[PDB]
Amino acid sequence: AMNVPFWTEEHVRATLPERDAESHKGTYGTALLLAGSDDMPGAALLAGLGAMRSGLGKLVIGTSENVIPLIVPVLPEATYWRDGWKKAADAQLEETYRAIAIGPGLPQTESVQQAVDHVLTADCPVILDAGALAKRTYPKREGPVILTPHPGEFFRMTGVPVNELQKKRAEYAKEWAAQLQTVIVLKGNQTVIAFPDGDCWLNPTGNGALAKGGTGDTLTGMILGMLCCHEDPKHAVLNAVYLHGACAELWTDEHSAHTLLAHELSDILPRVWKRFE
Amino acid sequence: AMNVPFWTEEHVRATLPERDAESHKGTYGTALLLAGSDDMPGAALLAGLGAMRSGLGKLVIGTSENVIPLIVPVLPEATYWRDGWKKAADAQLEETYRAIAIGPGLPQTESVQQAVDHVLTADCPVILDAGALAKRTYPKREGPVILTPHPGEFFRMTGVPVNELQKKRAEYAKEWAAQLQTVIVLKGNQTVIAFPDGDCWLNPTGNGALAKGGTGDTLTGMILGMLCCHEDPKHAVLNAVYLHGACAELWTDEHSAHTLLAHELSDILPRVWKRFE
Amino acid sequence: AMNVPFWTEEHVRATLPERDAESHKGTYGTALLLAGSDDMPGAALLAGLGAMRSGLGKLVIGTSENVIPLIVPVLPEATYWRDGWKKAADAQLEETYRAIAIGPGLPQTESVQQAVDHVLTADCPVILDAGALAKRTYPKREGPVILTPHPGEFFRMTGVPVNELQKKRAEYAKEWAAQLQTVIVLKGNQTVIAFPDGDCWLNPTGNGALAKGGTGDTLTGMILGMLCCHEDPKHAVLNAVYLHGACAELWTDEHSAHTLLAHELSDILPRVWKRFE
Amino acid sequence: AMNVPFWTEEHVRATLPERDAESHKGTYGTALLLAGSDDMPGAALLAGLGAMRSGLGKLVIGTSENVIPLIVPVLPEATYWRDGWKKAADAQLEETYRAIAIGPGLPQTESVQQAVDHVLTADCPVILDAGALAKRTYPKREGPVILTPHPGEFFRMTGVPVNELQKKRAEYAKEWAAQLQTVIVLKGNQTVIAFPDGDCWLNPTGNGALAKGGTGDTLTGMILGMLCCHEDPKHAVLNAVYLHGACAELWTDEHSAHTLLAHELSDILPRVWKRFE
Numbered sequence A, B, C, D: 001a002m003n004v005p006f007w008t009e010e011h012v013r014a015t016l017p018e019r020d021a022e023s024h025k026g027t028y029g030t031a032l033l034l035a036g037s038d039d040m041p042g043a044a045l046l047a048g049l050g051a052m053r054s055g056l057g058k059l060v061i062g063t064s065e066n067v068i069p070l071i072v073p074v075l076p077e078a079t080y081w082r083d084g085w086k087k088a089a090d091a092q093l094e095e096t097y098r099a100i101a102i103g104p105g106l107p108q109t110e111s112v113q114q115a116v117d118h119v120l121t122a123d124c125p126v127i128l129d130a131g132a133l134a135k136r137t138y139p140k141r142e143g144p145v146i147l148t149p150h151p152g153e154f155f156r157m158t159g160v161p162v163n164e165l166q167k168k169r170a171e172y173a174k175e176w177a178a179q180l181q182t183v184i185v186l187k188g189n190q191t192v193i194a195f196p197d198g199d200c201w202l203n204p205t206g207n208g209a210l211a212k213g214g215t216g217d218t219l220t221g222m223i224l225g226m227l228c229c230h231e232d233p234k235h236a237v238l239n240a241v242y243l244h245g246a247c248a249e250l251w252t253d254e255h256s257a258h259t260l261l262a263h264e265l266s267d268i269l270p271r272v273w274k275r276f277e
């Protein structure tokens, strides 16, 4: 009904960054990921791999003590802020980060919202997903706030029932991005990327291989990394959603859509990303 | 002697499900796996990988605290019900699952049977394997009960000695599926899939590469996942047994039958499944 | 000086076993591996992978509590006898095994020799390696005892200095196999396989890619598995040593000899073994 | 301005060692790596893999108790000196090593400098990286001391600000190698390898795929291993830096430069090294 344009291959090619010969890890920044809890530890690994695969310089993972050891053998490149997501509830961050994500595998609690409020006082883009998504408002700040709800989380945020939401996805996503003054990545087939300045796009990539636990955790990480290597954070969000879906399309060329595991999207991204360079 | 028909490539092709563009993980359900104990932890990873590879939406693994960390780095997509198989002995499940499996790597104890009795009060298909297999009867309930004995476990269930069983496999499997009113997947070369309504099939795939620890644990998981994406639970069971054996046949094209490890069946399934689409 | 014959490709092809369609894991037996200690845990994983890759039915790993979790994510198919190598020092094994190995990554202590003495009362082939190798004698028993010393361990066993040993390898290996009434696999370039009945062979495969920590741990496991699927335990030993070296030769076709890691021999064996079928 | 020559493909080919048929792990020595701490554990795995991939015989990793289990499943070939880097602060090493590295993932503390002072009393080449880099002087000793600073660490060592350093990299690196009487590998695009005898080279390989956490940790390990298989420790340093960068160039043929993870350099080295033989 709205004619929201697709973010196309041509837009991706035109906007993906270079990685210059004269750069070091500091050029691409240090990200922070606040993710993973004792009965949902895997979401931290998924998002971690997503982020380190996606062109950042360094990654600090703020997760519980019990989760740390489960990440290290698979993602040895990350370092840790021990019990970081709980510690973020107590004070403003003393360290400076290029971008921050919070929520995958975190309980949807008031302590998590406190950590959200502290993270928002930093001057960098911030992603809120999963356990960090709630019905709330957002303080005026410099850097973008990026919310990544699936339709269930959108219902939690807005009170718009899922059955109604799904009939008018882009209309609701635009309306709430504007009201909240946040980016909203409203997930699903034809994911909507709605910006608080009124720009809105649809994502043309992805398939049912993504309809399985963990794929959104991986996406949150991909957005986190891309925010560190793109000059324009809009392009980071758009390219992460696009390339995330493109990795699922590569998988289905020679593998059944029923059989993808989320972490494999990260394994596939190196070759898919190269295609768009 | 009986002319039990084979479930053939043509039957598999005709019955494997689609994964629609307009679906999400909830479309394919949340399964529960109750598996893994302190000296047999690996069976939980094997069955977990089997299940997540096999087209479910989400997987919760109910296993002991000591087993959880051993699964997460390999299968980060699963979440946990901490000490779940022990907790299931104490009360009906409060959560709703699309399908449930119990038994791989569990001790063959009365506490495990209590957990079985509680799981059976849910309205979903239930698989019982390994430590959950015992001589018993089953309450009338809506969803199918699927027993996956090898010949030793069948002897434990029925008192039919293995030497006698193996002379008349389909006859015994049919007789006991009918008596018990359960599906029986009687494993071995030419696995028998006997339904309590009298339908019975033989499986034509598989080889001696499967004659090694863990392959039945992986199968239980494959059945669990397929029950979540097939509309007809009969087809889920049949296709899981078939594709399980087909992965062993792919392996032996270029690898010795002596050298397969069970977890690799799960790694092979993506490409094998695609062949049948 | 002696004309000890090489165990050749033709001997390997003539002696490798079939894996029949009508077999199950019990056909190929349950092996026991007593290996791994707190500061040398990896040797248990190396030998475990070697063994499960090499055609056994099941593998029980008797290792310390702290080592168990380090094996499970990589080799989920093994089960455990918790603190098994220490417990073996206290009594004869109550369980029956198709073959047993002891020593990789175990401290060279009197407690380990006690565990050796208990294992020797079983009726199955037994391999002694590494920490289980000492200067001693062996009781008359039914099954073969297989010692796998490198030249340093041979010096420890016999008092023959390494410099002298290495001038007359097959002569010393034969002499001591006869004296001890054990098989001796005297490792090195042109490994000597000396039988206590006077048969003796040289191994023609392998290269300097093997000259790195862990490769002998992997070999001990390969011998353990092959003893379970070969009818003649002589052929098991000969084929394990041969195929172990052949995997290093495959590696060097496209990879530098400086860069092999022991666990990769196990990864390579599936395709190498197939070549000899 | 200086015409520092590049260490070229031809120099690498002329200087890489053979791995003779008549060698064993002892021929290539035992290295010691003192690396990894509770919130930076991964650096020990990265450097460990680097080292074992790079032609040593054995590797002992001296790291904290909590780090050990995180390494073993990925690098089972290493053994451990439990809490080794802390224990090295208390006394001269009783064991003899072919080469030693210290610092990746270690806190930059006085206790680490004490461990440095003890390691320096050994007669072998010693690498100091990361947490072991400080403003200090070095005792006259037989074996080379090899410092591997990035420009930030060089500033910490010398007081030369990074902005000034980067205008005259080889001039500063030569000056300080001479003053300190240490090798300095001054990292960055066109890494400078400055020897205390006045030889100096530039490295022509590498790209922005390396501009991400962990790649320097992997390099320290590669240098450690190469010091064990090269007769001339100068060639070890030069070839490690060259081949490290070459692995990043192989990656970018078919993968985006944004997406490399440090541990993958180690995975790539087997095939890259073979190219130069």
Ligand SMILES: NC(=O)C1=CN([C@@H]2O[C@H](COP(=O)(O)OP(=O)(O)OC[C@H]3O[C@@H](n4cnc5c(N)ncnc54)[C@H](O)[C@@H]3O)[C@@H](O)[C@H]2O)[C@@H](O)CC1
Pocket: A039, A040, A041, A042, A043, A044, A103, A104, A105, A106, A107, A130, A131, A150, A151, A152, A153, A162, A187, A188, A189, A213, A214, A215, A216, A217, B023, B024, B025, B026, B058, B076, B077, B078, B079
């Ligand atoms: N491996 C892990 O550690 C995992 C952790 N996860 C975490 O589990 C927590 C809960 O998130 P979940 O998303 O699993 O569960 P939720 O219960 O929050 O949301 C799922 C529900 O949202 C609705 N929904 C979602 N997508 C929809 C669509 N396209 N159309 C219509 N309705 C839709 C449905 O009502 C569905 O039942 C989060 O913290 C998440 O990060 C999940 O990602 C699963 C994997």
Ligand SMILES: NC(=O)C1=CN([C@@H]2O[C@H](COP(=O)(O)OP(=O)(O)OC[C@H]3O[C@@H](n4cnc5c(N)ncnc54)[C@H](O)[C@@H]3O)[C@@H](O)[C@H]2O)[C@@H](O)CC1
Pocket: B039, B040, B041, B042, B043, B044, B103, B104, B105, B106, B107, B130, B131, B150, B151, B152, B153, B162, B187, B188, B189, B213, B214, B215, B216, B217, C023, C024, C025, C026, C058, C076, C077, C078, C079
């Ligand atoms: N990695 C792990 O954690 C593993 C766990 N496992 C668990 O170990 C427990 C015991 O199960 P097992 O099956 O190992 O041992 P069992 O002792 O229960 O059954 C094996 C016996 O059954 C008979 N049998 C099985 N298949 C046969 C056939 N085709 N023909 C004739 N006789 C046959 C034989 O008597 C054989 O000795 C289960 O909980 C199982 O899930 C096993 O799957 C081994 C791997």
Ligand SMILES: NC(=O)C1=CN([C@@H]2O[C@H](COP(=O)(O)OP(=O)(O)OC[C@H]3O[C@@H](n4cnc5c(N)ncnc54)[C@H](O)[C@@H]3O)[C@@H](O)[C@H]2O)[C@@H](O)CC1
Pocket: C039, C040, C041, C042, C043, C044, C103, C104, C105, C106, C107, C130, C131, C150, C151, C152, C153, C162, C187, C188, C189, C213, C214, C215, C216, C217, D023, D024, D025, D026, D058, D076, D077, D078, D079
């Ligand atoms: N990843 C792990 O957990 C590892 C554990 N390992 C364990 O470490 C223990 C000690 O065994 P090691 O072999 O490392 O050390 P040892 O000190 O027992 O033996 C090595 C010595 O034997 C001699 N030697 C060996 N091969 C020779 C040859 N071809 N020619 C001449 N001399 C030769 C040399 O004197 C050499 O220094 C064992 O329990 C072993 O299983 C080792 O395999 C290293 C890897």
Ligand SMILES: NC(=O)C1=CN([C@@H]2O[C@H](COP(=O)(O)OP(=O)(O)OC[C@H]3O[C@@H](n4cnc5c(N)ncnc54)[C@H](O)[C@@H]3O)[C@@H](O)[C@H]2O)[C@@H](O)CC1
Pocket: A023, A024, A025, A026, A058, A076, A077, A078, A079, D039, D040, D041, D042, D043, D044, D103, D104, D105, D106, D107, D130, D131, D150, D151, D152, D153, D162, D187, D188, D189, D213, D214, D215, D216, D217
């Ligand atoms: N996975 C892990 O366990 C990791 C551990 N690491 C450890 O973290 C510790 C701190 O080392 P880091 O290097 O991360 O952080 P540092 O804060 O010590 O050094 C980074 C700073 O040095 C400067 N710098 C570095 N390279 C430069 C170049 N080419 N041009 C200009 N300026 C440059 C910049 O000021 C930059 O902010 C070390 O012990 C290191 O081994 C890091 O390697 C990150 C990964």
Ligand SMILES: Nc1ncnc2c1ncn2[C@@H]1O[C@H](COP(=O)(O)O)[C@@H](O)[C@H]1O
Pocket: A150, A187, A188, A189, A190, A191, A205, A206, A207, A208, A209, A210, A211, A212, A213, A214, A215, A216, A217, A219, A245, B020, B021, B022, B023, B024, B025
């Ligand atoms: N059928 C589908 N087609 C395209 N994308 C999908 C489909 N199912 C799920 N996804 C994507 O998978 C992710 C699910 O996120 P989450 O539910 O948070 O794990 C989102 O990026 C979705 O847009």
Ligand SMILES: Nc1ncnc2c1ncn2[C@@H]1O[C@H](COP(=O)(O)O)[C@@H](O)[C@H]1O
Pocket: B150, B187, B188, B189, B190, B191, B205, B206, B207, B208, B209, B210, B211, B212, B213, B214, B215, B216, B217, B219, B245, C020, C021, C022, C023, C024, C025
């Ligand atoms: N020789 C064989 N041919 C075909 N399938 C086999 C063979 N040996 C074992 N299997 C299969 O491997 C699995 C063994 O299950 P379990 O004993 O529970 O681990 C079952 O699915 C068997 O049907």
Ligand SMILES: Nc1ncnc2c1ncn2[C@@H]1O[C@H](COP(=O)(O)O)[C@@H](O)[C@H]1O
Pocket: C150, C187, C188, C189, C190, C191, C205, C206, C207, C208, C209, C210, C211, C212, C213, C214, C215, C216, C217, C219, C245, D020, D021, D022, D023, D024, D025
């Ligand atoms: N240069 C070489 N050529 C052939 N085999 C080797 C060589 N170096 C080591 N090996 C083999 O590697 C293993 C070393 O055993 P160990 O020292 O116990 O780890 C043995 O099987 C040796 O025969």
Ligand SMILES: Nc1ncnc2c1ncn2[C@@H]1O[C@H](COP(=O)(O)O)[C@@H](O)[C@H]1O
Pocket: A020, A021, A022, A023, A024, A025, D150, D187, D188, D189, D190, D191, D205, D206, D207, D208, D209, D210, D211, D212, D213, D214, D215, D216, D217, D219, D245
């Ligand atoms: N843009 C680049 N080109 C070449 N090498 C690089 C580049 N960025 C980083 N490196 C290398 O990556 C490593 C970084 O080390 P560190 O900062 O200690 O992790 C060094 O070996 C650098 O020389």
Ligand SMILES: [Mg+2]
Pocket: A129, A130, A150, A216, A217
């Ligand atoms: Mg989500």
Ligand SMILES: [Mg+2]
Pocket: B129, B130, B150, B216, B217
């Ligand atoms: Mg079973």
Ligand SMILES: [Mg+2]
Pocket: C129, C130, C150, C216, C217
């Ligand atoms: Mg050895």
Ligand SMILES: [Mg+2]
Pocket: D129, D130, D150, D216, D217
């Ligand atoms: Mg560094």
